[PDB]
Amino acid sequence: AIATYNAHVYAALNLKSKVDTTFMAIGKTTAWTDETNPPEPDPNATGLTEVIGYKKLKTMSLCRPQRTGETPTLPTVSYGNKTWVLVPDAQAYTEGAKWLYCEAEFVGDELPVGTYRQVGVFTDLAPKSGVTKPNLLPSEVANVGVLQFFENKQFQNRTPQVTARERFVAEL
């Protein structure tokens, strides 16, 4: 079962290759049992609970945590308190980038407005023939693809005047 470090990088590179068909979803319109303490995400999930809609990623890149004494030349994303170094595909193995960075914005009413508690990334999403737009209602997706990673968090309310920028880093 002993996989190499490079096996994880290979898996991350494989996800990045699916960029043209990678979408970030928002869901869970209904309240958690405890709104202040969301339950831990169960890996057996094949999709989001009460999926609202799908949004094509603004950015998808391989990455790795910054070293303590490193002054990075490459771009950095500063997720609250911890810095990540974005690595181009060619330096994947040399940099040991076994993590994947994903970013997407939910601008106003492009998807139905309301509360949401879930964020997840799907690869190989089939938009119904005749649709190119990055914002897809669940009735507009032909086959949701494969839910790769998701997160359960405290509710956020979205209005036609609100732009929600959702970004996350997943280890592979």
Binding positions for its own copies, rule: CB under 8 A: 1-7, 10-11, 14, 41, 43-46, 77-80, 93, 99, 119-121, 123, 146-151, 153, 156, 158-159, 161-172
| Least distance from its own copies to the Cβ atom of residue 53, Å | 16
Comparison of 140 and 167: residue with beta carbon closer to its own copies: 167
| Least distance from its own copies to the Cβ atom of residue 129, Å | 24
Q: Is 167 in the site for Cl ion (CB under 5 A)?
A: no
In sequence order, what are the beta bridge partners of 141?
A: 127
Those residues whose C-beta lies under 8 Å from the C-beta of residue 67, and which sit 6 or more positions away, are none
Q: Which two tokens stand for residue 147?
A: 């839910």
Those residues whose C-beta lies under 8 Å from the C-beta of residue 86, and which sit 6 or more positions away, are 61, 62, 63, 74, 75, 76, 77, 101
Binding site for Cl ion (CB under 5 A): 153-154
